[PDB]
Design a binder for these strands. Structure first.
Ligand SMILES: [Mg+2]
Ligand SMILES: [Mg+2]
Ligand SMILES: [Mg+2]
Ligand SMILES: [Mg+2]
Ligand SMILES: [Mg+2]
Ligand SMILES: [Mg+2]
Ligand SMILES: [Mg+2]
Ligand SMILES: [Mg+2]
Ligand SMILES: [Mg+2]
Ligand SMILES: [Mg+2]
Ligand SMILES: [Mg+2]
Ligand SMILES: [Mg+2]
Ligand SMILES: [Mg+2]
Ligand SMILES: [Mg+2]
Ligand SMILES: [Mg+2]
Ligand SMILES: [Mg+2]
Ligand SMILES: [Mg+2]
Ligand SMILES: [Mg+2]
Ligand SMILES: [Mg+2]
Ligand SMILES: [Mg+2]
Ligand SMILES: [Mg+2]
Ligand SMILES: [Mg+2]
Ligand SMILES: [Mg+2]
Ligand SMILES: [Mg+2]
Ligand SMILES: [Mg+2]
Ligand SMILES: [Mg+2]
Ligand SMILES: [Mg+2]
Ligand SMILES: [Mg+2]
Ligand SMILES: [Mg+2]
Ligand SMILES: [Mg+2]
Ligand SMILES: [Mg+2]
Ligand SMILES: [Mg+2]
Ligand SMILES: [Mg+2]
Ligand SMILES: [Mg+2]
Ligand SMILES: [Mg+2]
Ligand SMILES: [Mg+2]
Ligand SMILES: [Mg+2]
Ligand SMILES: [Mg+2]
Ligand SMILES: [Mg+2]
Ligand SMILES: [Mg+2]
Ligand SMILES: [Mg+2]
Ligand SMILES: [Mg+2]
Ligand SMILES: [Mg+2]
Ligand SMILES: [Mg+2]
Ligand SMILES: [Mg+2]
Ligand SMILES: [Mg+2]
Ligand SMILES: [Mg+2]
Ligand SMILES: [Mg+2]
Ligand SMILES: [Mg+2]
Lengths: 155, 95, 206
RNA sequence: GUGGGAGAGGGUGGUGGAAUUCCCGGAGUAGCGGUGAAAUGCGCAGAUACCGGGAGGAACGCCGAUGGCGAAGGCAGCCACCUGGUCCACCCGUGACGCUGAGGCGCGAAAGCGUGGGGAGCAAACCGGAUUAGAUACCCGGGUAGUCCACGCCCUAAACGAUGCGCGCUAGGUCUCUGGGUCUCCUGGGGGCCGAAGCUAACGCGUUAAGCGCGCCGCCUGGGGAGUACGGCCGCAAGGCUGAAACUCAAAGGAAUUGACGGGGGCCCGCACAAGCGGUGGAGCAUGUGGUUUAAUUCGAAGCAACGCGAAGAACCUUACCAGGCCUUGACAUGCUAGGGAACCCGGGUGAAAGCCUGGGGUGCCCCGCGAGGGGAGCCCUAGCACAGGUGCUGCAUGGCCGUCGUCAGCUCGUGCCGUGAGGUGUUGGGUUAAGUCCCGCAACGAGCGCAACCCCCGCCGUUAGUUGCCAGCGGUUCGGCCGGGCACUCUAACGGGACUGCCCGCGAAAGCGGGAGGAAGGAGGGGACGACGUCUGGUCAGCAUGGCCCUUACGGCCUGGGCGACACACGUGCUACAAUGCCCACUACAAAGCGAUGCCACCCGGCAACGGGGAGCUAAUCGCAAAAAGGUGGGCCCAGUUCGGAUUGGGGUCUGCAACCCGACCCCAUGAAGCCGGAAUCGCUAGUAAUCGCGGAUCAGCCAUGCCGCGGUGAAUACG
RNA sequence: UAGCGCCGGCCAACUCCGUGCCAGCAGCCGCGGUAAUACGGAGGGCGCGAGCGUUACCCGGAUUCACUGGGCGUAAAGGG
């Protein structure tokens, strides 16, 4: 992208819970354009966040977001033969993104065959707990902080 | 490794295959990134040409030579090829 | 050599077909192999005319083959003589209802193929190609053109290495669709070889 | 002569401080140093970093500068002494005492040399360390002459302003050092910059000439050989000065121009990198391609721009390959000489087919014409010939066509203007834009081929409509839009209308950008088609075309048998995967756009299916392929080489074909082989995109079709930079 | 009696065949790698004529030793 600031799209409302960014989640789970099929193993992860620690999925996903969501991260460089991953402050575009990406990812390297359940456990690995969900974002924040040794390279 | 030879418009006579083999064989004694080549030798009228495509690490450098020998372009091809293999290594060591 | 033949580009646009009828599925190749046998007769037969556009109309049983020309006596004949001379083996090539016909051109040098087959002509004649090309387009332009061009190819002095020789005056926007540009081709051959001729008349806007 | 000025001018003798290294003391602990990163090296035998003390050598920070001084080399802490050149004022004295200068003589950076000192830092040589194919180098740790002083030699240089000295003459602007004046100003000397005139091959020079003139000295006379040889002179040496030829070359050169290129610099575009969804590579098969096999495993293509390309259909057809078998005035082209025969239908001989061996029915014809018959226009065969025929050569002999950089923003011309000229200018600059798009500048002003625009697809609604549409509408309904009924909706397909930053906000000088109103749609609305002069001696002699080149019962034609599917190995592009978003079954929805006669074949019946036999309707908005699938009803699998795998082999079929061993695809039944998502690398993709599924088409007996070209479903992941 | 030279450019006089970086031309730049006006023959053409060409040497073109009449910042050339 050599010319302009490169605009990003405004994604659909959730007609389920009322929110534009939940529709945003649908699509990372999914392949071959499935708003039925990957939507089931998260719409059988709608009834699975009501059937374990139930309340309502309403704030489970208002708190599944900022909970593994990084404000400080690595994007690298090289000086004439030495390469530095450099701690950096990610914008409302990167900060709505990092999240929904790993969501499905590490949750699917897991054993429990149906992700209607397998990923559902992962909305409580954020808003609340531990896992492989919160695993990377520490190293994300950890190459930031400690290896802020290299933040003297900034943009 | 593999010296691939193309005798289109030419022979690729076994004894001459020896000639061409030895020369790239020399070359390989200076540059260790090389994977494989395909060389294509063809004669027209006066100019008996040679052209190859040369794979360095993943490849690739390539070049062509003329001459009225068919042995000339052999001498030439190497020479051009050489220059660009040396560039390959340096500016790379310069990163 | 990255362009188009500017006529096949203008068909249904600035310009219409030189054989136009209607056919059925296996009813086609036939009537097609016909007019292509018809010029196949009219190519070798009609040459010293000026032999420019042969516009071929049909129906069932009945096909009216128009010819549009330069020298209407090189065409018509002695009172009736030539027009029905060819008309023998013609509807006797067709075996159907044919019709021979005549149209003379206004500035025959406002037709490309015509203008060019003089460039072709001058070329095997062993003449001045630099001049000829130059000559041709100069003709065309005071001749009421408002743009014009010529291409010719192969050994222009008969020397081994070929060339491509080129001249144009006045606007010639090939890429413009409101155009009306004649193309016509002239293929010449002398003892050194074949050549080619590519002529463009610009006939004005739309 | 008087009087004054500035200055790193020179020589001698002294003396000041910072910093470096070394040594002694103190203090203190695990590393320092060094590089791109390292290593050598130093360091617990106490380093580095810090404090104090001491020794010694070299250079002279700030001032300091485009500055000053000297004839040049060259000269920089400060002080004194000794000393040179120089400028100014005054207008005092001398009275042409001037200028130049072959030899001569003196001076002469650095390095080098001799004797003696000195020797901190640095550093040729030299030793290590790394780099590297090597590294007798570059970078790193050491390190000797030397660098420093005295005296004596050396005498070279890009010893350069690459410009000899003196004098006179020919605009100025500017700043600077330094004298003088009645002081923004002027006058004398010096150092720079731009420039009148003039000079110049050009670059450039220009009161500090490279201008105009005069004097005198030095020097040049093609490049290499060669500053070599010889002789001479000088030197301790190194070597210096003077300085040839033979031979060889058709050039060597100076400045400038247009490009190309740079491990030159700037500003900018592309899914170019980044960043993402996915792939190849690693699996098995398809197809292509490399190698080898073969008697043929037929040619082309080859980085980008060849490898599901030519090939949109190889069982023998095809088919340019090969064996055996044939055939020749030829399979075909005109042409004519000499005859038959006048055409023809059917056999039949040996045949693998060809091919060759041979019986017989048999002419309508324009005319002499009852006629005996006749040229015969046929056409047929035999002999002839000219020749045909050649996918045998030459894509560096070519046309046409095409790939290419690239849908990239460019390539140019007229006329003017600049230059002796090549050439420039325009077309550059600045601002925008997808763009040489436009705008503002401007010695240019226009114009051409490009761009855009004009042409189709798609998306708003209108126009003209309806044998496709419609309980929209009322009604029956055989309850299927069936009909009475209905042209309004959807469809359909010809015209249309339109949207331009037109409008308001912010910027602005304009173009335009930034911003919004509305609008189905906006800043070209999204896609095609279109591709500049030219480039690659790109591709094609195998589509066709064409100059020549050579074969002329063969390198020509046909046939049969085989081959292009061999198989030790590699690669290219690909389909199905290697599982739970998943593996089956049954239940059941939704698209267009196409294609249809010894075609689409509705429907039945046999069969397991392939399909077979029957059967209608169709030249086809009204008949057939036709069933769209994924999805979705919800059911079986429960991490399982498996109910993932659909592959090698087994059986018996089916179809078309004269024919399926080589070499056809579909069927039912049996093998149910890899393959656990894949290294290192690497190939696409900015919307209805990837990605997943499905349908149609060419071509074609049939398909070795997963490919080529299209149609339609849901629907993203990542872009500041 | 008629001959000699040449016919790429300088430099007046062009086509065909043979040859195919070979044979050969050549005073200079150069020509010959298969259609060569440059080789070798032929036809023709130009030039001169009892000669025509070659070689050697002299002056010229050499304004290239520059008195007439050259130069030296970067072309050869200002002496350290
Ligand atoms: Mg005095
Ligand atoms: Mg100590
Ligand atoms: Mg100075
Ligand atoms: Mg006196
Ligand atoms: Mg006197
Ligand atoms: Mg000296
Ligand atoms: Mg010295
Ligand atoms: Mg000494
Ligand atoms: Mg000694
Ligand atoms: Mg070393
Ligand atoms: Mg060192
Ligand atoms: Mg010594
Ligand atoms: Mg000198
Ligand atoms: Mg002098
Ligand atoms: Mg001097
Ligand atoms: Mg002088
Ligand atoms: Mg001055
Ligand atoms: Mg001075
Ligand atoms: Mg002045
Ligand atoms: Mg001069
Ligand atoms: Mg000489
Ligand atoms: Mg010397
Ligand atoms: Mg001597
Ligand atoms: Mg000595
Ligand atoms: Mg130069
Ligand atoms: Mg450049
Ligand atoms: Mg550059
Ligand atoms: Mg070509
Ligand atoms: Mg071509
Ligand atoms: Mg001009
Ligand atoms: Mg002029
Ligand atoms: Mg010009
Ligand atoms: Mg340009
Ligand atoms: Mg302008
Ligand atoms: Mg051809
Ligand atoms: Mg997968
Ligand atoms: Mg003469
Ligand atoms: Mg002449
Ligand atoms: Mg010979
Ligand atoms: Mg040639
Ligand atoms: Mg000659
Ligand atoms: Mg001759
Ligand atoms: Mg003269
Ligand atoms: Mg003279
Ligand atoms: Mg003189
Ligand atoms: Mg001279
Ligand atoms: Mg010089
Ligand atoms: Mg002197
Ligand atoms: Mg001297």
């Amino acid at each position: 992208a050599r010319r302009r600031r490169a605009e990003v799209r405004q994604l659909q409302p959730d007609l389920v819970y009322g929110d534009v960014l939940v529709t945003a989640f649908i699509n990372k789970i999914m392949r071959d354009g499935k708003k039925n099929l990957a939507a089931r193993i998260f719409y059988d992860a709608c009834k699975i966040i009501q059937e374990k620690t139930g309340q309502e999925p309403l704030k489970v996903f208002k708190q599944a977001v900022e909970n593994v969501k990084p404000r400080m991260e690595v994007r690298s460089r090289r000086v004439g033969g030495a390469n530095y991953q450099v701690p950096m402050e990610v914008s409302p575009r990167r900060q709505q993104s990092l999240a929904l990406r790993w969501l499905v990812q590490a949750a699917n390297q897991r054993p429990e065959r149906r992700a209607a359940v397998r990923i559902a456990h992962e909305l409580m690995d954020a808003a609340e707990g531990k896992g492989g969900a919160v695993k990377k974002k520490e190293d994300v924040e950890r190459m930031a902080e400690a290896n802020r040794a290299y933040a003297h390279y900034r943009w | 490794m593999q010296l691939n030879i193309t005798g289109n418009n030419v022979e690729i006579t076994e004894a001459l295959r020896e000639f061409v083999t030895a020369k790239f064989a020399k070359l390989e004694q200076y540059f260790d990134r090389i994977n494989q080549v395909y060389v294509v030798l063809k004669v027209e009228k006066v100019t008996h040409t040679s052209d190859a495509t040369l794979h360095v690490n993943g490849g690739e450098i390539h070049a062509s030579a003329e001459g009225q020998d068919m042995y000339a372009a052999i001498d030439g091809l190497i020479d051009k090829l050489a220059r660009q293999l040396t560039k390959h290594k340096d500016k790379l060591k310069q990163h | 050599g990255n362009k188009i033949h500017p006529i096949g580009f203008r068909l249904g646009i600035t310009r219409d077909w030189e054989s136009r009828w209607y056919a059925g599925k296996k009813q086609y190749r036939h009537l097609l192999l016909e007019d292509q046998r018809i010029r196949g007769l009219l190519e070798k037969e009609l040459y010293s005319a000026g032999l420019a556009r042969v516009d071929i109309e049909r129906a069932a049983d009945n096909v009216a083959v128009t010819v549009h020309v330069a020298k209407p006596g090189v065409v018509i004949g002695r009172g009736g003589e030539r027009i029905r001379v060819l008309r023998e083996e013609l509807a006797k090539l067709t075996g159907k209802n044919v019709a021979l016909n005549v149209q003379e051109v206004q500035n025959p040098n406002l037709s490309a193929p015509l203008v060019a087959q003089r460039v072709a002509e001058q070329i095997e004649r062993r003449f001045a190609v630099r001049r000829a090309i130059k000559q041709a387009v100069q003709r065309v332009m005071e001749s009421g053109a408002k743009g014009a061009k010529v291409i010719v190819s192969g050994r222009i002095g008969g020397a081994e290495q070929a060339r491509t020789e080129w001249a144009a005056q006045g606007r010639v926007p090939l890429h413009t669709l409101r155009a009306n540009i004649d193309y016509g081709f002239a293929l010449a051959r002398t003892t050194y070889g074949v050549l080619g001729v590519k002529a463009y008349i610009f006939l004005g806007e739309v």
